[model samples]
Target: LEEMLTQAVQEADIEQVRQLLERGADANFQEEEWGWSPLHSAVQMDSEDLVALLLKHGADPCLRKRNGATPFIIAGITGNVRLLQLLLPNVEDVNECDVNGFTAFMEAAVYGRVEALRFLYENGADVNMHRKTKQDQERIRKGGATALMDAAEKGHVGVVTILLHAMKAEVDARDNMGRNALVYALLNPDDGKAKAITRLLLDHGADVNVRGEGSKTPLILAVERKNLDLVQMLLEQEQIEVNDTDREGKTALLLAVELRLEEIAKLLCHRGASTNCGDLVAIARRNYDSDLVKFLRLHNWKPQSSRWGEALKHLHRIWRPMIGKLKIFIDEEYKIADTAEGGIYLGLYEDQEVAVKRFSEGSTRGQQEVSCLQSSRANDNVVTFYGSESDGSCLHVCLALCEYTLQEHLANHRGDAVPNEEDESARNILSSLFKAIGELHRSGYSHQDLQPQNILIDSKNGTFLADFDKSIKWAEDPQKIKRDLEALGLLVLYVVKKGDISFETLKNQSFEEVIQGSPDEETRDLIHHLFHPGDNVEDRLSSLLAHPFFWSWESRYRTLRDVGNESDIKTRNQNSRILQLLQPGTLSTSFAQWTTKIDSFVMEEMNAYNLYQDTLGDLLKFIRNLGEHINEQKNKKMKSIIGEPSQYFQEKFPDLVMYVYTKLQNTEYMKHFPKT
Candidate 1:
């Protein structure tokens, strides 16, 4: 009979529900699943008569279900102001919270029930109330999150407006994570309503650079997320701190360059974000492939002053050498590095530490070192020449100082068990070594003594090439360049192995044993190939710098996407037909390898893997064919790859689609596919 009453209530049969109540059938019959009452069903149907009859027969409005959802909460979710009004008087408390601290008004805001939210506000809903029940308060305090933040994050502009304008919600009200509604709004910058909500929050005085979880400012998160449009919006604000570092010490400019978001980086630089933030200039220079290096250099402020001298000076020995005073020059450009003889010691020059190498009167190395160092000063990986002064009896050469030599750096890492973070230190050191060595060869000079003792590790642990005393101007000689590469290869292996193997041991070892200490297949293969390179040494070096071993997948996706924006692979890159052939059907086979779905296209063609060393760049063809097939509109297999290209890629490569958007600003590359 009780069930019959619910049946009548749901059916909207007012007379039958009344008759059932008259027969003493309970008005409040709750289903076991969600504890739904007869009045709840009446509210769902919005039948005035059934709701009234059920309420008259003792149907309680405040009863909660498993999730603490009440009839009042459901009414708010439904956005029916009339049902909210009907249920209001019976509601035990206007601000009654559920399991998660969501009151009716909070539910209304999230569900975009603007009118219902306003009604609740007028009916005494706590405008800023979050979780209040102790258990639910824990959850609420966790969001320390507000209805405004939820609405802003959900992109409900009307709901947010009601919360702000009608209810007068705090625009800068932060949640449990120490973030305000503005941060929540920009969290999903791609949402159509995101920009409007962000603007709404900003206009109301949301703090633009407030640190949230991880001590990250809004600008850091904006750039970290690759939200190019939103990043510009944040920059336009007057109080924005463009160079504010995150918990990891990353600035907005640092992240944009790292993610390859070129335009965003430009906006940050325009606002004065320091280009000197931890290897920002060095990594860009090492990338050498992209136009970003030149772009970053334009914004980069080089440390320059005549007082911090840049030339080799001949200091008259008689008066200037203050062996007692410890100052080397009268101008005080360098202070003596504490040493017994004229030798390499730490010098206080300008503001930082530098390596000051001194030679006896009989030594022939002073001028040769100075001249070679002059050619490579432009590179950060190469030791920079500040200036040198001769005390007449002995000559002093001032260069950038380092905490350790490559030999000493490798020795410190010898046999340590914590290999993960240390492995990163090794890869960084090696890549810088490549940049160091490659820059010298590019400048037509070779470090004839290319050994571990010659390389230096700076205070920040950056690797630099120094000690060019035995240097000679090779002037494009492949043989001498190859010799430097060989020495660099050995150092690369030493760093990779973390000093387990000896240089003399490596000199006698077989190919497999030499690279056995490498962490993975690609690192070893890269080292192996550098041992023996091919023709088109330009192509080899360009690709060498592009080696997948040096960077993370985040860096890899940016690069592979770049190949698309560069249709240059066809008409622009000459002697690259084989290089262009390097992209065809590449991902077809490897994409199968990466994703579990085993679909094979080529038979017996190890040639593809032979041309390229490892996996990531295989997607170049995948990205290129997308525009190719979509524009050409032919070839069913090719065309299928482009059909709902996002869906196809999403299903085909679900793990990697986050890196694949066709927009130039958002994904940072692949702009070749013209959006119609």
Candidate 2:
């Protein structure tokens, strides 16, 4: 009977299928050999005529085949608009989440089949169907997730946006882990459209400060990616708490500072992040030998010159009341207006239309925000810090006001038709943003938050970066500086908001997709040539450096071009000439090597598995180890052991005997600091 049903579907013989159905052959009959059902075969064969006939004859569109996919899914996957159109109406559940919580509509949209997706949507296909298929069940066992989550993760902007607009779909729907579409987008590394999608979601009322299972929000993910622009976007929302912590009690500022993201740290501080949140200072002090500490000291409190004077007095006053006690409070004036995943919030401040951020007290991201805010204190774009008030029950830091954010402007223009101007408005915005960022960098600081919302427009001039909740000092370390630069570059690319450049175009042309080459061939040629290696590599580098894209007009006018000093020009020329001497390459080998090393190390440590494991372990292990060390040091009758715990350790185990005697080795020593 199954063979007859399959054959009937293959031949597009509606009469035969109907006859077979009437002859006690199940309309949804599946072949035991391969699990191929009549509906699957019909869709697989592109027999829309057969599919319509089978449905009419009682073929089940939702029946699973061998691969565990339903006929509706198969039709959607096959890009069969006609088949989808026919079956969507008859399907009992248009939003029926498939094996992996995927809806037929999601599948169609994923394949970029607009016609199929539109047909299915028009015919009652649900856009936010969860993938509840067997495969999805398996995936859930590993990591709880849903189809909208998957679509957002994969950068299927079309599917994501479509789902957001679908009648039955919730733009701010949270998956099992509480991650929204915006959070998923932020977590995606290669999705250049993530910022744009975030803007769309925010404009459409998606929460900007909602935290997931671990109290980790999109802002934390942005910090993890070192994408300052996204961080700034969240900060500017007046809804996202800059100092919110994750389950592990680490804030975004702590993460950035630990990773030596000075610019990001500064940005977080300027936005009124708490410096005292989540043992941030201790985490940062772990890498005290690094430049981040110096930067932090310079911005957070008094400078090094005052460290022993007013700073010490100030510290004493702050710490005198708290002995193993921490206080946190949400300001009465601050109210949550919007929230994304991870329990983040858009706090509305009563003072001057400003934003108030309320971070999770016990989260890793909270510490991060606090750490960054305490370390960097110089930048015009950053929100001015008002006084902080703490009463052993709550801590609140106020911030100055600013005009409408770049995000708001972008949201206003989101649904606008593509421009007719030759110099696209997007390009101009990008160019202007890059120029401002370059100026920010040249001025000895990096704007860690480099998103549209952070780029506030001046009433007279163009845009300027704001919300320095994560800005950092420009470091001498070439790699750190490069990371700062590259992050900004990615933000500029992300906020261009041009859907005209499809993924296919990027897949085909690589980076060239970003550089237009048509009516304006000169600009394109200049870009291409500047990037190309040349014999006078240094000279070429210098020339390229002189371009407005690399150095802001303000910087150039102030330092080289405007000074009108022949010697300044000569010095610039010499620098370029020296670079050129190393023909066929503009960047130094040392710089390249440093970047490679940085990338390799960062990548190795930032693996999703390792990040998760380390995060869990760090939080748990810190508690366990602290207890053990305390127990060991506090031996009964062992009095007169002055100094802190470290002094006791040295006195008790002078030659590190305690480590060997007590078998006090760390669990992650093997995994994190493995010996070659």
Candidate 3:
């Protein structure tokens, strides 16, 4: 309306505005203050007669205000179909959008004004009109969202049905982020409407395998949200890739296992989710979830070696301490060593070599040892416990037999018979000790005796921790664990620096010049850093575990198994890649010049044949013929690796063997074999 007349309609002074408009007032006056004409104000008031009068007086129904949308959008948002109809006659463009790319048709569809939506659709509004903002921020979507997506997201079933069928809206048009109507439908928290809307999208053949954020499929997203119903619904699609991975290479089963969704895991497994790709069994063990471990076992998955077994062994240590004393022999053959209280004897407990500790009857020391050992579960680095029993005069404790103590091994290495300790092999020993002691400390026990003697060294089986007699269990903040770590440092120094120095000597002397270029500066610093740890740097035991000094080939090999079963298959075998680069290729290929060093080291010093034919291809053939080898030489093949030659695999070309191990061990990951 005109300036004076505009005020009349502005306050809806009805008869005056009607009379002003009838008296040839400017009905289409756009007020600079509000930037809206009289007809726009009429729609806002829902004054039916005023709206009709303004329209007849040539009010521009499609006119957009300065910062607001068209008046018809207001009518659409208000779901005033009568107002929409009154405004549409003079509207030349049914789909005339606001600066924000919004149309009345979209507002009506999203707001579920079905009749208004139909009228606008027939008049010419793009059902597929993707709303966009100047900055693409999606302030009010239906980002680049269609009317169908908006309706589906809001769970407006009738609105969705009309958009899908009557209006023939494009089913799978994506938003700016590559999200489809199916994704929007899944965003609905209402189960009933979510299911209905989702079914409609899928029935119309919406993309079931769309990779949204993170390149994750619908099934992966469903699993991530832990929506069991959505997971099942997505799995119902024949086109769905149940085993497809995200950019991180995480499959649905991997997520279900990580999420602890047992039923979902089973559903994925039953539907042929590749268990071989990622081991759910090891994840359960790594999570320390005993119940889940048992659950996987019930589903025919077992774990052979895990800390879980150690916890169980500790439980059984308390539950059943019977050692079957008849299995022990105290004769000359079994006699091994003498201790303060009694003798240590080697015997056959279960057809396996076991060392038995003999304690005088009624002595409290051996039972104390038993209690401490009981607090610990069996670990590769920790001594294995068979059981405990007693005859009339002596208490007998059975343990896994070892070749020598770390102290004896050091002395032997000091001796001329063998060379100074193989540095790589020493890394293995220290690495194993760190893993063992870390677990022992974290389990609330301190190996008060981390001396070389209490730690056993095996040539084949590696190392073992023994003599828990001085060990304490179940306490925190006493900082006794600190002393345990310090003791560990002394042992580490002894191994790395290749000789023992008194702790006082380690403290007072600046041994930096003495340790200059001694094997690794990392070792010297690690030791001096650990000498008096209470000051700067705190001397955390974690430092010893992740130390660069131990990043030798052996530790990386062991590190592979550390994550071997737990990791998803790393597609490019990082080791295999190393192997390929190191072998004789072109000038730029094997140009490291160490290729000759590797050849000479392997063929001359280590005494192996061609690394190409004998090592690489042969192993590949064996792995490729694994199925044949299983039945062909399977049992025979299984017996080959657990001994000294296995050390050969772990030592030389570790990653190569580890690459095999990481691939083949998880080959169905089956489960841990039944523990004794």
Top candidate, metric TM-score:
1
Could you give candidate 2's per-residue lDDT for residues 81-189 as a string of tens digits? 7777777766777666544555666766556666676776766665554444465455554333444565666677776676667544677777655667777777666
**lDDT, candidate 1, residue 13?**
62
List of clashing residue pairs for candidate 1: 143-176, 144-175, 144-176
Q: Over the stretch 1-676, how does candidate 1's per-residue lDDT look in tens digits? A: 4565467666676767767866778766778888778877777666766667777778888988777778887787777888787778888888888776788888888888877887888788888875544555566547466889889878898788778887788888776667888877777656568878878888889989787768888878877777787787887899998778888788888878777777887788877888777767655555453677777767622322233234213232222324422335423334323333465654445534455777775566766787888887787788778877656677767776556767777787675546433255766777777777777777788787676667777656778887788888886565666666666667777767776676777766766776776655546667777778654344244345545456553344444445544554423343443243343342443254542342343211212332322333434444444434454523455455345444344345643432332112233343422221
Q: Best to worst by lDDT, what's the order?
A: 1, 3, 2
RMSD of 2: 31.3
Model 3, C-alpha of 171: deviation from truth (Å) = 1.2
Candidate number achieving the greatest lDDT relative to the actual structure: 1
What lDDT score belongs to each candidate, Candidate 1 first?
A: 0.65, 0.51, 0.65
Model 1 alpha-carbon drift over 4 Å, by segment: 1-24, 44-49, 133-141, 282-289, 300-676
> RMSD of candidate 3 to the true fold?
25.2
Q: Per-residue CA lDDT of candidate 3, range 1-676, in tens?
A: 2466577776766778767855667876787876888878788777888888777778777777886577887777767778887877767777777766678888886678778787778878888878766664654332687888888878898899888999889999988777888887776777788778888889898999786777888788778877788888878888888889999899988888887787888789778888776667877777676666776766522222232233223332332223564355455544657777767876545544567888876777786778877767655568888877777778887887677777667666655324423467567777788778877766667777567667776546378788876777747445666676666666676666545554345444454543443444456656655555663323355555544455553443343333322322222243453334323243231112322523342223222223323333333332332223334343454434422322444334434532333333333331211111
Greater TM-score among 1 and 3 belongs to 1
User: How many clashes would you count in candidate 2?
Assistant: 89
Q: Show how many residue pairs clash in every candidate, following the order shown.
A: 3, 89, 8
Give the C-alpha miss distance for residue 399 in model 2, angstroms: 53
